[PDB]
Ligand binder design. Sequence first.
Ligand SMILES: *[C@@H]1O[C@H](CO)[C@@H](O[C@@H]2O[C@H](CO)[C@@H](O)[C@H](O)[C@H]2NC(C)=O)[C@H](O)[C@H]1NC(C)=O
Ligand SMILES: CCCCCC/C=C\CCCCCCCC(=O)O
Ligand SMILES: *[C@@H]1O[C@H](CO)[C@@H](O)[C@H](O)[C@H]1NC(C)=O
Ligand SMILES: *[C@@H]1O[C@H](CO)[C@@H](O)[C@H](O)[C@H]1NC(C)=O
Ligand SMILES: *[C@@H]1O[C@H](CO)[C@@H](O)[C@H](O)[C@H]1NC(C)=O
Ligand SMILES: [Zn+2]
Ligand SMILES: [Zn+2]
Length: 155
Amino acid sequence: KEPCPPENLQLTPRALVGKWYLRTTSPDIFKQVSNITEFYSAHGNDYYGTVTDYSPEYGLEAHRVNLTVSGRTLKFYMNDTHEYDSEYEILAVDKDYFIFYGHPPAAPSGLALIHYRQSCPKEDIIKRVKKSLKNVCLDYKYFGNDTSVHCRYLE
Ligand SMILES: *[C@@H]1O[C@H](CO)[C@@H](O[C@@H]2O[C@H](CO)[C@@H](O)[C@H](O)[C@H]2NC(C)=O)[C@H](O)[C@H]1NC(C)=O
Ligand SMILES: CCCCCC/C=C\CCCCCCCC(=O)O
Ligand SMILES: *[C@@H]1O[C@H](CO)[C@@H](O)[C@H](O)[C@H]1NC(C)=O
Ligand SMILES: *[C@@H]1O[C@H](CO)[C@@H](O)[C@H](O)[C@H]1NC(C)=O
Ligand SMILES: *[C@@H]1O[C@H](CO)[C@@H](O)[C@H](O)[C@H]1NC(C)=O
Ligand SMILES: [Zn+2]
Ligand SMILES: [Zn+2]
């Protein structure tokens, strides 16, 4: 139900700006949704953005979302639907990924999300991710990967 979050917890300005791929989660969600692209524009503590997800019945849907960042945490709001709308805590910060944790409606007991800068991250990045997870009391063991976007390092 909880990780053991870091010492500092520092989340800097524009740090989330631009393009991400949500390829790994614990609760594996990649039956409910697939091929998640995020794009965020920074407006101080506010981000506004697009999430292009694929649905196993509906299409290539798109969603408008905004972050509101408060130090270690942010609030995530999606316009069209609200099952991932919750507070999320930053667990790890890296040039090639961020890890967040929350208790949204879709997983009240806890949801870990890895956002990658690359769609198919190289084995170096995965080894750092593995470290970040142990370092906050989760492990790649209980995470699923988005297999609809084949990646030899995420299998
Ligand atoms: C995953 O989503 C991406 C981008 O969100 C898809 O790429 C799009 O592919 C269509 C082809 O019909 C183009 O018209 C778009 O302009 C493309 N966008 C980009 C950024 O390339 C991609 O095809 C999707 N893949 C899966 C497996 O769902
Ligand atoms: C670098 C990460 C940016 C910050 C995003 C905040 C953390 C969690 C976002 C929740 C996304 C949940 C799923 C996305 C789309 C969907 O499943 O419908
Ligand atoms: C995002 O926008 C919503 C709707 O305008 C508003 O409730 C709030 O300021 C923002 N919330 C989050 C979670 O970013
Ligand atoms: C959805 O977005 C529109 C912006 O056109 C806004 O007026 C509406 O109240 C939003 N609400 C929800 C629940 O998504
Ligand atoms: C996800 O990726 C890692 C390799 O990066 C692997 O050890 C783990 O088993 C994968 N899980 C699934 C369910 O694909
Ligand atoms: Zn919690
Ligand atoms: Zn493969």
